[PDB]
Amino acid sequence: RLRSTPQDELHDLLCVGFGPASLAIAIALHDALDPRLNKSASNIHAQPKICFLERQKQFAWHSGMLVPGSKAQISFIKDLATLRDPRSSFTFLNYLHQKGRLIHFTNLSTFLPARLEFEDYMRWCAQQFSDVVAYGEEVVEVIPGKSSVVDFFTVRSRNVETGEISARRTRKVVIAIGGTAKMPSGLPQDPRIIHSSKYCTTLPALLKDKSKPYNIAVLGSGQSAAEIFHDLQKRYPNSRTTLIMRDSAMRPSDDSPFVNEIFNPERVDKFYSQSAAERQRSLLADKATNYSVVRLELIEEIYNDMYLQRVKNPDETQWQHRILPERKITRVEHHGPQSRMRIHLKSSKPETLEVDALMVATGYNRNAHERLLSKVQHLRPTGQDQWKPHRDYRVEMDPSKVSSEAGIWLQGCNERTHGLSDSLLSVLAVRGGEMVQSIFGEQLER
Amino acid sequence: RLRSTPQDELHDLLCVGFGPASLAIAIALHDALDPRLNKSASNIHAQPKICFLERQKQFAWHSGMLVPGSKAQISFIKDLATLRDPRSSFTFLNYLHQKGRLIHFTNLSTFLPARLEFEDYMRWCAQQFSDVVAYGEEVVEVIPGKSDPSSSVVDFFTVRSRNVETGEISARRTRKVVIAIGGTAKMPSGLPQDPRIIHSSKYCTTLPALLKDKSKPYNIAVLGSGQSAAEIFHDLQKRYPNSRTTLIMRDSAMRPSDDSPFVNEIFNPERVDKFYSQSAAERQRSLLADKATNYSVVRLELIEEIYNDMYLQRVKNPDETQWQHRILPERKITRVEHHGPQSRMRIHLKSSKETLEVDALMVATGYNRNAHERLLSKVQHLRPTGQDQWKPHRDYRVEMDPSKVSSEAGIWLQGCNERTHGLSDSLLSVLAVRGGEMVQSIFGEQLE
Amino acid sequence: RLRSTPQDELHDLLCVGFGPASLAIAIALHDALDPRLNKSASNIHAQPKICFLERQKQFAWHSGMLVPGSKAQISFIKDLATLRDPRSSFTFLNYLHQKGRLIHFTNLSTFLPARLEFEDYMRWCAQQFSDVVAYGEEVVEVIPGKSDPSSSVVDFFTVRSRNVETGEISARRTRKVVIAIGGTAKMPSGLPQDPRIIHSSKYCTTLPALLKDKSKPYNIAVLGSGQSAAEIFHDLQKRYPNSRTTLIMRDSAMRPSDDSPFVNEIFNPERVDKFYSQSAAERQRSLLADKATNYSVVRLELIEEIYNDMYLQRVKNPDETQWQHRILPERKITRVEHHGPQSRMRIHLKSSKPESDVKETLEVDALMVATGYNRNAHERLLSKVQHLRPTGQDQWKPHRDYRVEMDPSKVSSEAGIWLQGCNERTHGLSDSLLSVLAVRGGEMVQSIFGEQLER
Amino acid sequence: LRSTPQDELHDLLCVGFGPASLAIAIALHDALDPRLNKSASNIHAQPKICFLERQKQFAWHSGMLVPGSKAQISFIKDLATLRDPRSSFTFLNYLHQKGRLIHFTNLSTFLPARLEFEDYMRWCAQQFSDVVAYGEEVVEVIPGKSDPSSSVVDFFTVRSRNVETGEISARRTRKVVIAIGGTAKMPSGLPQDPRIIHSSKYCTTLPALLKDKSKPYNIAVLGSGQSAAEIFHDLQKRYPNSRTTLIMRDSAMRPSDDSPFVNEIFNPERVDKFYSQSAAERQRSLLADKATNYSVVRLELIEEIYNDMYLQRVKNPDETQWQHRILPERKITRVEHHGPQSRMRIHLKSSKETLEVDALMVATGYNRNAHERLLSKVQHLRPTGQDQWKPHRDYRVEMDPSKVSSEAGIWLQGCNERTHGLSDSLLSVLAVRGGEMVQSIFGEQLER
Numbered sequence A: 001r002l003r004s005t006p007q008d009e010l011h012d013l014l015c016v017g018f019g020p021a022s023l024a025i026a027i028a029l030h031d032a033l034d035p036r037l038n039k040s041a042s043n044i045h046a047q048p049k050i051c052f053l054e055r056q057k058q059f060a061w062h063s064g065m066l067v068p069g070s071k072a073q074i075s076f077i078k079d080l081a082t083l084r085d086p087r088s089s090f091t092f093l094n095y096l097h098q099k100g101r102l103i104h105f106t107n108l109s110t111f112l113p114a115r116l117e118f119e120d121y122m123r124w125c126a127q128q129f130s131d132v133v134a135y136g137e138e139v140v141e142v143i144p145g146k147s148s149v150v151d152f153f154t155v156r157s158r159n160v161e162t163g164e165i166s167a168r169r170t171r172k173v174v175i176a177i178g179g180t181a182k183m184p185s186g187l188p189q190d191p192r193i194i195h196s197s198k199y200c201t202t203l204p205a206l207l208k209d210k211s212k213p214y215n216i217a218v219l220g221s222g223q224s225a226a227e228i229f230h231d232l233q234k235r236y237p238n239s240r241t242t243l244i245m246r247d248s249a250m251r252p253s254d255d256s257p258f259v260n261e262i263f264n265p266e267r268v269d270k271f272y273s274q275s276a277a278e279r280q281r282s283l284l285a286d287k288a289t290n291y292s293v294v295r296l297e298l299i300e301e302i303y304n305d306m307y308l309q310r311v312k313n314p315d316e317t318q319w320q321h322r323i324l325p326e327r328k329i330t331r332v333e334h335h336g337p338q339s340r341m342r343i344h345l346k347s348s349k350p351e352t353l354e355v356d357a358l359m360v361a362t363g364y365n366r367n368a369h370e371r372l373l374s375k376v377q378h379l380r381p382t383g384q385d386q387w388k389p390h391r392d393y394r395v396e397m398d399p400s401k402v403s404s405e406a407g408i409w410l411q412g413c414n415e416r417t418h419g420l421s422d423s424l425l426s427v428l429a430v431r432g433g434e435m436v437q438s439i440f441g442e443q444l445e446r
Numbered sequence B: 001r002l003r004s005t006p007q008d009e010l011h012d013l014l015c016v017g018f019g020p021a022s023l024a025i026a027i028a029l030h031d032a033l034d035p036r037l038n039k040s041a042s043n044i045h046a047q048p049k050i051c052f053l054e055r056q057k058q059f060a061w062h063s064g065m066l067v068p069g070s071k072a073q074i075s076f077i078k079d080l081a082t083l084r085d086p087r088s089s090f091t092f093l094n095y096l097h098q099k100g101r102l103i104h105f106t107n108l109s110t111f112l113p114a115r116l117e118f119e120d121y122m123r124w125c126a127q128q129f130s131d132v133v134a135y136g137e138e139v140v141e142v143i144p145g146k147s148d149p150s151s152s153v154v155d156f157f158t159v160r161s162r163n164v165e166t167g168e169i170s171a172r173r174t175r176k177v178v179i180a181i182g183g184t185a186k187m188p189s190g191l192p193q194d195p196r197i198i199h200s201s202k203y204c205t206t207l208p209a210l211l212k213d214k215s216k217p218y219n220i221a222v223l224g225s226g227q228s229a230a231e232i233f234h235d236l237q238k239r240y241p242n243s244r245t246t247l248i249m250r251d252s253a254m255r256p257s258d259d260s261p262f263v264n265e266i267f268n269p270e271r272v273d274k275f276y277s278q279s280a281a282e283r284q285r286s287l288l289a290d291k292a293t294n295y296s297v298v299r300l301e302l303i304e305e306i307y308n309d310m311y312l313q314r315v316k317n318p319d320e321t322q323w324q325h326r327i328l329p330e331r332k333i334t335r336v337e338h339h340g341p342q343s344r345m346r347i348h349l350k351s352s353k354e355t356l357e358v359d360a361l362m363v364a365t366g367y368n369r370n371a372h373e374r375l376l377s378k379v380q381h382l383r384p385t386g387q388d389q390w391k392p393h394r395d396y397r398v399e400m401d402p403s404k405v406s407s408e409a410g411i412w413l414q415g416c417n418e419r420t421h422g423l424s425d426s427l428l429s430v431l432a433v434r435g436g437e438m439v440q441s442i443f444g445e446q447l448e
Numbered sequence C: 001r002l003r004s005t006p007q008d009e010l011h012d013l014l015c016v017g018f019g020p021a022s023l024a025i026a027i028a029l030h031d032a033l034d035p036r037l038n039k040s041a042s043n044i045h046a047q048p049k050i051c052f053l054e055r056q057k058q059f060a061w062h063s064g065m066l067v068p069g070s071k072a073q074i075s076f077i078k079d080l081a082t083l084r085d086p087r088s089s090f091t092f093l094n095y096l097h098q099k100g101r102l103i104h105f106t107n108l109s110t111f112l113p114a115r116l117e118f119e120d121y122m123r124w125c126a127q128q129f130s131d132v133v134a135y136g137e138e139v140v141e142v143i144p145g146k147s148d149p150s151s152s153v154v155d156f157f158t159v160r161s162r163n164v165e166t167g168e169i170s171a172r173r174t175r176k177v178v179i180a181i182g183g184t185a186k187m188p189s190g191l192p193q194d195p196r197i198i199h200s201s202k203y204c205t206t207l208p209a210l211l212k213d214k215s216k217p218y219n220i221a222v223l224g225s226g227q228s229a230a231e232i233f234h235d236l237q238k239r240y241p242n243s244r245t246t247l248i249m250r251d252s253a254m255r256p257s258d259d260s261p262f263v264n265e266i267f268n269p270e271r272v273d274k275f276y277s278q279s280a281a282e283r284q285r286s287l288l289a290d291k292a293t294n295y296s297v298v299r300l301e302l303i304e305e306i307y308n309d310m311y312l313q314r315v316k317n318p319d320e321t322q323w324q325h326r327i328l329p330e331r332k333i334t335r336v337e338h339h340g341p342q343s344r345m346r347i348h349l350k351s352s353k354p355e356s357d358v359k360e361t362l363e364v365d366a367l368m369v370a371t372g373y374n375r376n377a378h379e380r381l382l383s384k385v386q387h388l389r390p391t392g393q394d395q396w397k398p399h400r401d402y403r404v405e406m407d408p409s410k411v412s413s414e415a416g417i418w419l420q421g422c423n424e425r426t427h428g429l430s431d432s433l434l435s436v437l438a439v440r441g442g443e444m445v446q447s448i449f450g451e452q453l454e455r
Numbered sequence D: 001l002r003s004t005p006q007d008e009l010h011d012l013l014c015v016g017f018g019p020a021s022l023a024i025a026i027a028l029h030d031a032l033d034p035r036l037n038k039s040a041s042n043i044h045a046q047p048k049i050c051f052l053e054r055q056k057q058f059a060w061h062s063g064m065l066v067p068g069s070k071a072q073i074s075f076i077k078d079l080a081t082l083r084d085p086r087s088s089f090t091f092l093n094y095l096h097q098k099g100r101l102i103h104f105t106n107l108s109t110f111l112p113a114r115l116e117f118e119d120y121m122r123w124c125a126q127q128f129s130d131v132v133a134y135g136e137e138v139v140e141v142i143p144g145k146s147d148p149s150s151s152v153v154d155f156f157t158v159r160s161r162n163v164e165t166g167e168i169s170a171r172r173t174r175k176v177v178i179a180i181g182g183t184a185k186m187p188s189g190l191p192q193d194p195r196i197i198h199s200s201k202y203c204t205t206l207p208a209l210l211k212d213k214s215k216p217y218n219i220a221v222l223g224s225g226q227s228a229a230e231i232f233h234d235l236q237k238r239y240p241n242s243r244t245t246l247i248m249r250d251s252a253m254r255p256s257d258d259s260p261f262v263n264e265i266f267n268p269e270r271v272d273k274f275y276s277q278s279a280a281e282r283q284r285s286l287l288a289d290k291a292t293n294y295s296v297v298r299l300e301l302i303e304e305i306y307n308d309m310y311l312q313r314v315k316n317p318d319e320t321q322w323q324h325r326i327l328p329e330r331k332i333t334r335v336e337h338h339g340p341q342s343r344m345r346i347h348l349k350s351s352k353e354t355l356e357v358d359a360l361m362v363a364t365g366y367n368r369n370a371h372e373r374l375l376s377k378v379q380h381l382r383p384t385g386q387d388q389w390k391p392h393r394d395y396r397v398e399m400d401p402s403k404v405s406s407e408a409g410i411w412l413q414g415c416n417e418r419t420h421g422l423s424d425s426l427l428s429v430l431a432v433r434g435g436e437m438v439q440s441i442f443g444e445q446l447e448r
């Protein structure tokens, strides 16, 4: 129901990216304007000028990792609205109800929906914001705007179909662009070296004959590495897969209830108020719940598959599918007509593979906003070489350089100040409401 | 925000009972009148005259069986609203949200709330209808009423109820009636009446009064093999830790409740259409097959706990006959001596293909769901010629002779129609969706 | 350790079949003769003359159903020896220890080993009896033996077997026979002979060669609703990722196996005594009240995986009739049409509800038939000795110790025939399973060799 | 195994008769059984062995035999199976001897009740009753020379205190095993008080101090490991009216890692790999491989505790009103314990408030250095310049070969985590290590 703002109008808010983090904001604004949900909203006859710029052509959630049978790693109660307001029309249960699937999901007796299903849930939510989302727009920079002090920002984006740069002016910016693929710096660029974010979308084109005895290595030891390692053995049944990890063993995600309260929405306050030293220590003492570990059930499945090989062949080094713990890649030969690369391995404490492909499941960097924001970084307080978000995700600005009606918010990249949940689905519903209060609260009071 | 209607005024609808079945109807009416949930409802400036009569003094859900650690046997998604409209303020999740408990319930990673919690959820729902519920009113009869006594057309009903505190009988006039009164204690015909013979529905409320010393070495028997039998047997061992408890069952073993997904689709709301349209022979056969009767089996997790406790007794003493707590399978009670001053009764046992002396016998043999026949006996002459049973249509309205009953009047049955509507009829399973159907059936024309 | 007996010598015992039931007997005889396990056995310097005839070319356990990821449906404690004597060298745990895998199995935290592994365990057991098992020998008949031509009494039996590779008939003489031949494929009547109609017992061995290209969009139907049917249905969807598979079941839904502890006491070894002592009517009734515990039901975890897979199809397409993989409940096959191998078979479906009407037709490249087994092939094998039964018996009647009743005026008591695995009606649901083999094997040795082992 | 006269020179004396020593007794018994290895048939002389135990009978952490407590390790890791499944001393054969084997199988669990696994080891121990001296607390080990003028020690004299009379006894042996588990580790800041009880004394000491199950005791529990959790949960049932508070340094109770790759560090055959690593790698491995033994809580028990806390939330949203509470991220800084008052005041600071309590249970684990005290009078026989006992791979400690006969020696069991792995103090490798110990100690003897 959100009406569009003209491209050349001065916006109230422009959000960079339309993944789950921005979608939660759009939904929370929708709910804030809904007189059923907020009685206070009946006397609001003016909608904020809001716009979302998304690089993809339509809504999509980690399509490279939509592997068969993968689940969203979160209870469905942590969807994009329920923890803020279970009456919202954007709840997962109401989505299922609109699809005619609610009773069918109930009979699953599961809290974790299939990843494919959760993407569709979010695609369904997003379709209600089609008038304020510009798809196919890759944001390239944010530049200051003065109309003495800076009181707006110009967001420049490149149209993915034509290459043209267009500019939009806004008082407030949100950067919610997720992460960029983290590749170990020793690895060369090669079409046979594919990051996990491109697994489902790039690997099938490279290794086309599912029946061939490909040799395929997987680098990493977290959730995505194990899903890829496990999926490969089913997708290419005659393949020889090898998991290369620095750690000594795949480690389980801690699913226990007291520990997992770190993901509670009201815990963001607790984490934020801790000292930097304490936040750093707290992140380490809960490493057992980040993406570097693996769902216990998947570890068990992988271990069981490995055991079956042991039944047939007691010599682990001869197994079709192997795990190589405490190893590091030291060299990659990838030149010449030969279609296999040779990977050189050494112990990672203080051996060569010939593979048709190397999947690299080493996680993400979440500092791409620094590039986008480089032309506004002189507005930070004296001596700051990093963006510092307040509790409400607004970055600190020098008050003599920036008007109080203007600002920039960061979403998804604030683990260091806001906790492990910051990059996850965990607190998006509640945070979406907080963001709407922080950015539009005063404006809506009318 | 449903306003009360005067007791001696002619009501549009009166529901007998305020358990989950009536509460779901109340919630669905509230939701139909909510212009936020139903857009067409903004132009509805008239609330129906509605009243609920509940014999208990406050809202309560099987409080005789609120055993510590007892869980609801249904996924919480099957609450009183969600399967009809997940946006409703009467969902379990919104209830938790209002209590500040939503995230905390999430970290439980469970679909089955404690019975104590699901009761509180429905208690919290019920409070939004306090103006239209008369508690402590035990309905005793429904009387046909003719605005024109000189005609044969019955066009309203008078519902008379006995106040449980005063004994005084009061009457209310209504054009439409709902009977949603659950079940009455089904007792084996051979058991005599004795205050030491207590049905499972009175366990938590009556047994402590009879057996006051939590420490005394009571001998307590439990008759049955279903969910309630297992809960009492298990609870007794903690509540009276020095007691000697005996589970007596005709069957050879406690059997697990089927949690598998294909089988449990019989409980889906949309199966009511399919089941209802089946022939009497096919519904009868389907009820025998499809699944074991509701509550005649035991949650697997509870069987395993009880078996583990039994095994621990085996570690301590290999002789089963000397165990504190015992299960006696394939048994039936043939005689109960209960006369004379000795506080214990003597239970005589025979194979179902030996005597026990007990201070109490808990009877967990389920419920009858035909009490509406007694309540409706003075209106049964209004059924079509020759009907000796109440026949509900798909929408739960009972068949009436159209020349004897105004079409603006009728009677609906809730919770007792398993034979025509399926095993889900007496459960929480389809209450949310059924509540909406009921609001359409009774008020559909009136609202449009 | 068991030494062979020369083929043409008079045997003490000959077992027909060398599956788990006979293997349990071999293991229990070995253990009875082991002075470590039985003190009384050190003073036994004579081994019974024993022989086993197995039609397969080597030991194999339901190899047609060794489907990827399949589990044995039993706790490993119910292996071929432990419940009789955990100290036995033939326990599953000792097998694991000998293979150097015991700690690795422990880290599985499972009581159910893979079928492939449980087969290997029993293969490992069987190899220790290689001197007394004649493989590739299909027993064809059992005929009476009269050692005295001046006497009418039968005091031995001749067992004739047809070598499966040469066709040559061999005869072996024995005083006592055990028939432990498992079951034969129960096929719906009326089916045409076509190599694409494959019983579940031939699944892994026949279907892959028949449908060689794992990528082709085959149509494959599966008949049944029990464990094997569900495994085949699920396996097909993974083995042939582009296939359209259809599960046809007479029941309304796949039903779960009862894993609850009180019910599963029907499988306890000591329950055989209670079941056997019941009346015929009561045994028949008891078999009814425990139907949800055999191979006619499905492990819950597998039901859930199949249900989850179907749900994923629902996510992609709300129209069930357009799904790649489908379940057609409450249907029966009325006809299976074929037009030669160059063409597809047509399966015609009708409701299985009592005749009182929404039917279907399927065109399939193969039909898997997961309908269980018949367990009466001993009647054909024993047909030439059946006149030795007591007057008026038209069925073989096993006593508690599995020895069948004989007319004592026709048959010496030093001779006899025992049946294994086909005695559910008298001995309970566990009779055809691994459940009581360890203990039953010990009973069989006492019944067959007890007196002989005292002297 | 037949008894050696107290006064004779023994081949082996083991200090302690817990699981570690018992596995050695079992492995010697099996090594002597000609049926379990053919070699032993021509072995006509039994080693002279005895065991000293301070408890009056075999008991496994009886102070922590909490109702419903479980073994924390699969029963396959009993005292014999991983070395020889044929041994008569396996857990499954125990069950068979007891007529319980099929009954345990129907439990479908790998974790026996602690009560049952204790009884299994008690059943094993009774087969060695002739060679175990109970009631004897070893207090010192002193050098012994067959010729007092020899420069070489060829035996050890082991002195023990009769726990009933305090009499000191002496026995002579070529070879000594110290297998004495751990002693209570108490945070240095706590004073001595009868109301401050270590978890090892929970079941045997706390009920003596707090006898009134009705009185609402304020009971504090210090710790976050398996024992703190079992005690916290058990207190809430044992004293139903009590207020229990769990004090822990960590932010949360953390779960045991049950995942299979991680747990290969406990496999028997890892000892070889771990031992041969450098001191620097072993030290790093011990922090990194797994959170220390018993410092975490079995997942099932955390969920039970969590569910109990949630039920309190249902009854009352104000956590500070809860009868049973958890105070994470806390340290105790002062304990006031003098004066007439029966309660002590516990002072709390952040570990980066006050409680008045009737008792303080301290579940802070154990030290495993008591062998240093017991061996101080033989530590001059170590190689020059050593200040610690240094076990070889086969657990025999280094000795100066000019000072100690090669037919004499001392082994350590259960205190060698730093050289042999986390599994050293656990049940994990006892069966295999018992076999190794027998070959190390009696190998030559059992060839001759």
Ligand SMILES: Cc1cc2nc3c(=O)[nH]c(=O)nc-3n(C[C@H](O)[C@H](O)[C@H](O)COP(=O)(O)OP(=O)(O)OC[C@H]3O[C@@H](n4cnc5c(N)ncnc54)[C@H](O)[C@@H]3O)c2cc1C
Binding pocket: A016, A017, A018, A019, A020, A021, A022, A053, A054, A055, A056, A060, A061, A062, A065, A066, A115, A137, A138, A139, A140, A176, A177, A178, A179, A224, A291, A363, A364, A411, A412, A423, A424, A425
């Ligand atoms: C398979 C999988 C793996 C995961 N791995 C991790 C992990 O390793 N670590 C972790 O902390 N979380 C991980 N997560 C959790 C994940 O981050 C959340 O599930 C969720 O995706 C976060 O939403 P977000 O909107 O902040 O980021 P996203 O889901 O990434 O959304 C970001 C959006 O911004 C768009 N965008 C990016 N740059 C531009 C641009 N310049 N201009 C315009 N649009 C742009 C993208 O197209 C995208 O739609 C993973 C989740 C899954 C499903």
Ligand SMILES: Cc1cc2nc3c(=O)[nH]c(=O)nc-3n(C[C@H](O)[C@H](O)[C@H](O)COP(=O)(O)OP(=O)(O)OC[C@H]3O[C@@H](n4cnc5c(N)ncnc54)[C@H](O)[C@@H]3O)c2cc1C
Binding pocket: B016, B017, B018, B019, B020, B021, B022, B053, B054, B055, B056, B060, B061, B062, B065, B115, B137, B138, B139, B140, B180, B181, B182, B183, B228, B294, B295, B366, B367, B414, B415, B426, B427, B428
């Ligand atoms: C412990 C327990 C045991 C169960 N056992 C069974 C079982 O054996 N079989 C089965 O099919 N289902 C059983 N159920 C499921 C149960 O029926 C549903 O959970 C649910 O209670 C049905 O709602 P209902 O409103 O139709 O009946 P109820 O929950 O029974 O509500 C009926 C209401 O009517 C009131 N009432 C009764 N008579 C009168 C009267 N004359 N006048 C006025 N008010 C009256 C009662 O006070 C009550 O509030 C059980 C549930 C629980 C929790």
Ligand SMILES: Cc1cc2nc3c(=O)[nH]c(=O)nc-3n(C[C@H](O)[C@H](O)[C@H](O)COP(=O)(O)OP(=O)(O)OC[C@H]3O[C@@H](n4cnc5c(N)ncnc54)[C@H](O)[C@@H]3O)c2cc1C
Binding pocket: C016, C017, C018, C019, C020, C021, C022, C053, C054, C055, C056, C060, C061, C062, C065, C115, C137, C138, C139, C140, C180, C181, C182, C183, C228, C294, C295, C371, C372, C373, C420, C421, C432, C433, C434
């Ligand atoms: C996949 C699978 C499916 C199962 N399905 C069922 C089922 O539907 N119903 C049920 O009650 N149990 C079933 N079981 C359990 C099964 O019967 C037991 O696991 C076990 O195989 C029984 O051992 P048995 O030795 O009595 O029979 P089998 O294991 O079948 O062994 C019989 C042996 O005799 C041999 N043999 C047969 N005829 C001759 C002959 N004329 N001459 C020489 N040798 C011969 C066979 O080759 C075979 O090796 C199934 C098990 C599995 C693994």
Ligand SMILES: Cc1cc2nc3c(=O)[nH]c(=O)nc-3n(C[C@H](O)[C@H](O)[C@H](O)COP(=O)(O)OP(=O)(O)OC[C@H]3O[C@@H](n4cnc5c(N)ncnc54)[C@H](O)[C@@H]3O)c2cc1C
Binding pocket: D015, D016, D017, D018, D019, D020, D021, D052, D053, D054, D055, D059, D060, D061, D064, D136, D137, D138, D139, D179, D180, D181, D182, D227, D293, D294, D295, D365, D366, D413, D414, D425, D426, D427
């Ligand atoms: C409740 C519980 C808590 C546990 N906590 C831990 C833990 O915090 N950390 C860890 O690594 N493992 C822990 N364990 C594992 C435990 O160590 C093993 O289960 C097992 O008990 C180890 O056997 P052990 O024989 O080496 O020691 P123990 O079981 O301790 O046995 C040692 C024996 O020696 C006796 N003894 C001691 N001193 C003398 C003496 N001077 N003279 C004579 N006898 C003596 C003792 O009485 C005792 O019987 C715990 C186990 C349980 C059940």
Ligand SMILES: [Ca+2]
Binding pocket: A107, A108, A109, B259, B260, B261
């Ligand atoms: Ca389920």
Ligand SMILES: [Ca+2]
Binding pocket: C107, C108, C109, D258, D259, D260
């Ligand atoms: Ca495990």
